[PDB]
Amino acid sequence: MGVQVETISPGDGRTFPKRGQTCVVHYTGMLEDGKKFDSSRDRNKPFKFMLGKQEVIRGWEEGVAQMSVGQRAKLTISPDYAYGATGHPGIIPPHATLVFDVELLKLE
Question: Which residues carry this modification: N6-succinyllysine?
Fold first, then answer.
């Protein structure tokens, strides 16, 4: 499968990221069992990435573009849209489905 987006709290429902914009987000990343492997909130610094430059996993590129500014959403990402068969040594196992709690703070 691809990426599923499940809403947690609504945004403005009007402003969606376009290609080339910088997305400023807080996020928490968890394995399918619920173990957290990454979180911007723990570092007290939002994460920025430019949509369309493939600086993040495909699931983020397609999932976050579906969010409006101010929305918090749950992205469930299958391995093909994520770290795939390889995974990431000692962080993400092979063939892992990931769950991201993501809040789109603003666009730049």
Answer: 53
The experimental technique behind this entry is X-ray
Give bridge partners of residue 29 from the DSSP assignment: 38, 100
- Could you tell me which residues are beta bridge partners of residue 3? 77
Q: Rounded to an integer, what distance in angstroms lies between the CA atom of residue 66 and that of residue 51?
A: 12
Task: Measure the CA–CA gap between 69 and 39, rounded to whole angstroms.
Answer: 20
Domain ranges (residues) in the chain: 2-108
Dist CA 5 CA 82 (whole Å): 15
Catalytic, 37? Answer yes
DSSP 3-state percent helix, strand, coil across the chain (nearest 5): 10, 40, 50
Question: Which residue among the candidates 47, 57, 81, 92 is catalytic per the annotation?
Answer: 57
Q: Which of 16, 38, 49, 80 is catalytic?
A: 38
Q: Catalytic: 27? A: yes
Q: Is 60 helix (H, G, I), strand (E, B) or coil?
A: helix
CA dihedral 42, 40, 106, 75 (to 10 degrees): -120
